[PDB]
Design a protein around this ligand. Structure first.
Ligand SMILES: O=c1ccn([C@@H]2O[C@H](COP(=O)(O)O)[C@@H](O)[C@H]2O)c(=O)[nH]1
Ligand SMILES: [Cl-]
Length: 185
């Protein structure tokens, strides 16, 4: 039956224009940290990765659908490069932090958090920072990526919509190997 890894997020469309930007940005970051790996799919988290008993997957998804489908779509900006780690500092990420639209993400998280509480699951991180992860590596590479590298990554981005005005259209829940989609209003 089992308990399934469950995660709620906004998917981010990997358009050619965005992937072409990564074609310039990520090799530059790899001159500092070659073992960075490009993300294959792109998302902005709305929940922690939690564990949910199997028989509650479908009811959890339906609860999310009910809430999300009355939530209005919005625009956001994600053009600020940031280095961050996972909680245990065994992985490092290069991401794009949301500026404009952060408050609307907080409102989405409020709704997701209520579903988490309904199913006795962990609510979102205190002091959250919404971001689109672009690449990751094992270990804590903050010392190598922050400073000169980060300034040059920011310069590449500043030199490039795609990032300025992204429209949220859907919310998705991954549970184990299952992916459940829903439209915003
Ligand atoms: O507000 C946040 C957002 C993300 N993370 C960390 O950043 C990792 C990568 O985030 P994501 O881009 O997968 O959401 C997460 O798994 C989590 O460890 C936080 O600590 N706080
Ligand atoms: Cl390396």
């Amino acid at each position: 039956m089992g308990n399934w890894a469950t995660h709620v997020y906004v998917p981010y469309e990997a358009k050619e224009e965005f992937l072409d930007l990564l074609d310039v940005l990520l090799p530059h970051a790899q001159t500092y940290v070659p073992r960075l790996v490009r993300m294959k799919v792109f998302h902005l988290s709305l929940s922690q990765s939690v564990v949910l008993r199997h028989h509650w997957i479908l009811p959890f998804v339906q609860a999310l659908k009910a809430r999300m489908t009355s939530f209005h779509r919005f625009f956001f900006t994600a053009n600020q490069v940031k280095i961050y780690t996972n909680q245990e500092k065994t992985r490092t990420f290069i991401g794009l932090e949301v500026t404009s639209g952060h408050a609307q993400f907080l409102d989405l998280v409020s709704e997701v958090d209520r579903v988490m509480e309904e199913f006795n699951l962990t609510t979102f991180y205190q002091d959250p920072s919404f971001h689109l992860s672009l690449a990751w590596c094992v270990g804590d590479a903050r010392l190598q990526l922050e400073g000169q590298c980060l300034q040059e990554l920011q310069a590449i981005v500043d030199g490039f919509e795609v990032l300025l005005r992204v429209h949220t259209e859907q919310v998705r829940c991954k549970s184990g190997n299952k992916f459940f989609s829903m439209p915003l209003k």
